[PDB]
């Protein structure tokens, strides 16, 4: 499996590692890829796309790297399964409600409720692991 993410301070990166740990604990392999090192072509062969990005600017996806990546794969992911996640700071998940609506609009099937954690995981470490286990059980 593949986990693609953008992280500015490392909070979403930490979530990605924990989600990966959950998938691995389930007996499966998975690679975590920072959005800047991703190969769209190889990524599109996956049955499930696991994508993460923290809330940026004013409740939107990060603009210089993550957003363009989503726009690029948008026309080629209809019917694909996707799981979404990310860290946030002061809002209540508006950027993620929009992200989920968007992916749905492109024809994707969002397999589980998006996992959003405030600031660094810490207390939510198990929740991240469990999210990965749910994905591996699909
Ligand atoms: C410029 C900037 C804008 C942000 N905008 C939002 C926002 O609109 N809503 C929110 O809840 N958090 C927002 N945050 C806070 C980050 O989402 C939060 O610190 C998160 O933990 C960052 O995770 P990361 O290290 O994975 O980037 C913003 C942070 C920065 C630096």
Swiss-Prot record:
**What function does this protein fulfil?**
Low-potential electron donor to a number of redox enzymes.
> Does the entry feature the keyword Nucleotide-binding, yes or no?
no
Q: What is this protein called?
A: Flavodoxin
Molecular function terms, GO-annotated = electron transfer activity; FMN binding; oxidoreductase activity, acting on NAD(P)H
List, separated by semicolons, the cofactors it needs: FMN
Q: Does the keyword Cell cycle apply?
A: no
Q: Which family does it belong to?
A: Belongs to the flavodoxin family.
């Amino acid at each position: 499996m593949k986990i693609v993410y953008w992280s500015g301070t490392g909070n979403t990166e930490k979530m990605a590692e924990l989600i990966a740990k959950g998938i691995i604990e389930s007996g499966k392999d998975v690679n975590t890829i920072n959005v800047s090192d991703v190969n769209i072509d190889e990524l599109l062969n996956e049955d499930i796309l696991i994508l993460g990005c923290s809330a940026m600017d004013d409740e939107v996806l990060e603009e210089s790297e993550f957003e363009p990546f989503i726009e690029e794969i948008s026309t080629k992911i209809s019917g694909k399964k996707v799981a979404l996640f990310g860290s946030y700071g002061w809002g209540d998940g508006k950027w993620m409600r929009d992200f989920e609506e968007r992916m749905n609009g492109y024809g994707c099937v969002v397999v589980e409720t998006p996992l959003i954690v405030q600031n660094e995981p810490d207390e939510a470490e198990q929740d991240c692991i469990e999210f990965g286990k749910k994905i591996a059980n699909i």
